[PDB]
Structures are given as structure tokens and as C-alpha cells.
Amino acid sequence: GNKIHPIGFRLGITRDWESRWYAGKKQYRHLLLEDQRIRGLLEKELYSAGLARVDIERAADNVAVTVHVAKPGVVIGRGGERIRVLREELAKLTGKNVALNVQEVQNPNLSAPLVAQRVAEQIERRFAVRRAIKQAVQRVMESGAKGAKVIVSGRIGGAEQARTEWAAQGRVPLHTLRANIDYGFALARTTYGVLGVKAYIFLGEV
């Protein structure tokens, strides 16, 4: 057990807060809680799309919600009827009355959370783990970026023994509180147990 979360270790600099807004004292908790709820819905729904991150800004009964996807068309929908149900379904949950934006992902092949879920899926589809991995890695590696690295839990293949798979190219400096490394964790339910998927992606500098 080691290696702090590269994100939170960088929250001060090269990386920000998924929920930026103020309050406190007697609202925070209630308000904060409110966030887990949305993120709750957006995640169980906009999956097949590529939920990458969920920014949530606030200014008193006026939330933001800016879902990050790779295939925004799925979030949107036919002509945009589904961004009507979600946007509306979100209210039946929070009467705060908020909007909902959707920013496409510039080559999801560079979004940790995605580079992982990608892998995740493959695993659940019973795909050689060692490959999906080496595969994903090269992808990132091959789509710009100066460094990538994917890690997969144990039971790789339903092995009776809890193993670990590696693979990783370029530079990936988790200690350099400046590097600006994207992180992401994909869980992998499976007939033989649960497998965790970690993906780091290193982009430029500042």
C-alpha cells in the first residue's frame, strides 16, 4: 500500500476540483451530498457514451453540470430529446433548477478514465488482459502524449492466484508535482471476482 493519488496530490497545481463552488457551515454537506447524487445518475446512464469527468459549479439555486463525453451524441440524443429527460430527471432529484452542458472529448484516447474503461470492458469481454493493456498503452503512446502506463488487478484470466499486469511507455513521473498526469480507475466485475484497472497518462508539462 503506497503511491498517493496522483490527482489529489496535484489538486493545488496542474489539476483542479470536479466540484468548484463555495458555501459552507450549514450547507456544504447538504450541497456536497447533492453532487454525489447527480454523479450518481450521470454515471449509471451516460456510460455507453464515455463519461470522463463531471464538473459541477454553483451560484445559488443555479448549478452548472458539464458532462465530459467522447460520444456527445449519445448524451444528447435524437435531435436532443434525451438531454431533455436527463436534464429533467436531474430536477426530480434536485429542485435547484440547473442546466447541463456536454463537452466532447478531444481524442478519448487521451482521457485516463476512458483509456481505462476501454481496458475494463475488454476484460469483462474475456479478452487477454496482457493484450488490452499493451494495446491501450500503445494507443495513448501512439496518439500524442509523452507517457502512459496501465495497471490491472489480479485474477487476470480467472487465475486462482491474484496477479498484476504492467506495460508502460515514455515518461510517467508521479513524484513530480508539476508533471500534470491524468489518472483514472476502472473497476471490472466478472464471473470470477473483481478486477481494478488503473491508467495514468502524462501530458506535456504545465
Binding site: 489529489g8 489538486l11 489539476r15 476540483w17 463552488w21
Partner: protein, 60 residues
Amino acid sequence: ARKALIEKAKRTPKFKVRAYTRCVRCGRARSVYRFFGLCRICLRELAHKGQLPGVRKASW
């Protein structure tokens, strides 16, 4: 965190002195913080994922 034991949200306590915090994610009612309402675990995590505004990693 037996779902049943998660009945703190059952206002009706018969005697307020019977109410108790409970985690709002783990249920882990052991060591919770009022400000956030998070089982000390279900807090260090979110605080890392960055889903806890201004909750910066302390340091001095």
C-alpha cells in the same frame, strides 16, 4: 452498515439522544465528520478524487 441499521434517517428516535450520524456512503457510523457527513474513509477518497471543493491536501 447493515441496511436495516441505516435507520438513523428515521427522525422518530423516541428520544433525540438516540440519534447518531452514520456515514452517508459507507454507512460506517464509527468516525464521521459533521461538516461533510463522510465516514473518514469515504472522505479521504473523495478529497483525492477532487469532489470535495477547496478540500486541498493539507501541508505545513
